[model samples]
Target: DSHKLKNFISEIMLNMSMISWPNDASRIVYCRRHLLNPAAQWANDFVQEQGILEITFDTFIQGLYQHFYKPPDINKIFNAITQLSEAKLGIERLNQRFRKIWDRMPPDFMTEKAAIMTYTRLLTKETYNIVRMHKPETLKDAMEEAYQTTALTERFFPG
Candidate 1:
C-alpha cells in the first residue's frame, strides 16, 4: 500500500492548486533575498530541486512562526536584530547596521516571549517585503535580489 494518504493528500493538493499562487520565479527570488544574510546564506543556494530539503523546511517553519504570529513588540525585535547583526558583522557590515536596532535595546530586562515574538516578526515580514518588491523570474534574479535587499535593508538599520 502507498504511504501517501490518498484522500487527504488529494484534497490538500486540490485546494492548493485552486488558489491563485504567486509566480514561482517571484517566490524563489523573494525567498533568496530574505534569506541572504550570513546566518541564512546556506539557504540561498539550497532551494534548488537537487538541494537539501531540510534547510528549506527549517527556513520556512521559522519564517511561518515569525510572520503569522501575532503581538509584535519592539524590544524583542531589538534583541533578534542584534543577534543577526552580530552574525552579519564582518561578512556584511551593512547588514550588521540594518539589524543594529535590536542591538540597541536597553539591556535592563525584558520578557522572553516578547523577545521571541519580536525576532520572528521582524525576520519574517522583512523577508516577505523583500520578495514582494523584487519578485524573481530566474535563479539569477533570485540571487541578485538577495544581495540587493541585504544591502538596502542594512541601510535602514536602527542604529
Candidate 2:
C-alpha cells in the first residue's frame, strides 16, 4: 500500500510538472479562467480582485477558509509540525524523493517561511501515509506521539 501510495504521489507530481501555465497569465488568473470548480474560481477571483501580488501559504489557506468556505485542517497542520520534528531524516528522504516537485513549487512558495508553511500543507499527504503506517485513531494522536518521540522540539517550534 505504501509503495502504491508513493507511486501515486509521484504520478501526481509528474502530471503537475507537465502542466503549463499560460505565459501571459498569472497562476491566479489562469486558475480563475480555467478551473471550473466554484471554490477555485472564487479563490482565484478573490486573490485577483484583492490585487494580491503574492500569496503566502497561510494567506491562501485563510482564503480557502474565508472565501471558499473551507475549514482549516488544524490536526493535519499540527501533524506536519510534529512529523517534521520527529522525522528529520524522513523529511530529508521525502525531499530527495520529491526533489523535482519541490523545485517545481510556485515561486511564491520558495522562500524559507513559505517553504516551512508549504511543508505544513504538503505534509497532509505524508500524514495520510503515516496514518496508514501507524494506524492512529486520530491524526492529532499521531502528532502527539511524534512530539513525544522528537528530541528537537525546541528547534522545530522555536520561540
- Strongest candidate by TM-score: 2
Model 1: colliding residue pairs: 78-102, 98-157
Relative to the unseen true structure, what is the C-alpha lDDT of residue 8 in candidate 2, on a scale of 0 to 100? 40
Those runs of model 1 whose alpha carbons end farther than 4 Å from true positions after fitting are 1-21, 48-159
Report how far residue 135 has shifted in candidate 2, in Å: 22
Q: What's the lDDT for candidate 2?
A: 0.45
Worst 10 residues of 1 by lDDT: 1-10
Candidate 2's displacement at residue 78, Å, is 25
Error of 1 at 100 (Å): 15
Writing each residue's lDDT as its tens digit, candidate 1 over 78-111 gives 4455555333443244334543544343443466
Give the per-residue lDDT digits (tens) of candidate 2, residues 33-100: 43337755676567767664656434543554444321333343334334444244644444443444
- Score candidate 1 by lDDT: 0.45
**Each candidate: RMSD:** 18.9, 16.8
- Cα error, candidate 1, residue 76 (Å): 13
Error of 1 at 78 (Å): 18
